[PDB]
Chain A
Amino acid sequence: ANLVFHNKVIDGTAIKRLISRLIDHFGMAYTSHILDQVKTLGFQQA
């Protein structure tokens, strides 16, 4: 996985743009699992 290393902030616009790029690169099956993991991480830090 050649993911870029974000080091500034993840706001609503950034997460929406990041997901769209993941669908194009990895597909909807990979991104569906990424969404499940990011959902837990966001809930766990809130």
Chain B
Amino acid sequence: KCIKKGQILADGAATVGGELALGKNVLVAYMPWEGYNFEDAVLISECLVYGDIYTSFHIRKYE
């Protein structure tokens, strides 16, 4: 592939195709559900869990 000076070569973390990508597009409904979204609670599906939709890597350092 021919490249110009200043064009993208690779994508980093939270970056897709040269854009900032901090989240996911998920199917969402806006309704009360048996009090499990009372106040500001959020009810989610297992698909977000076993699909690894919101899985993140966290690295600690011990010196």
Q: How far is the CA of A46 from the CA of B34 in the complex (A)?
A: 7
**B contact residues, total (Cβ < 8 Å):** 3
| Binary interface encoding of chain A residues 4-26 relative to chain B, with 1 for a CB under 8 A from any of its CBs, else 0 | 00000000000000000000000
Q: Which residues of A contact B32 (CB under 8 A)?
A: 43, 46
Q: How far is the CA of A44 from the CA of B34 in the complex (A)?
A: 6
Which 6 interchain pairs have the tightest Cβ spacing? A43-B35, A46-B32, A43-B34, A44-B34, A43-B32, A39-B35
Instruction: Give the interface of B toward A (CB within 8 A).
Output: 32, 34-35
6 contacts between A and B (CB under 8 A): A39-B35, A43-B32, A43-B34, A43-B35, A44-B34, A46-B32
